[PDB]
Amino acid sequence: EMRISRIILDFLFXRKK
Numbered sequence: 001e002m003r004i005s006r007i008i009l010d011f012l013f014x015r016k017k
Contacts, residue, residue: 009015
């Protein structure tokens with residue numbers, strides 16, 4: 001349960017993997 005973190009995460013990984 002996060003915010004933009006998840007978005008960083010997305011920037012981190014894409015949260016695609």
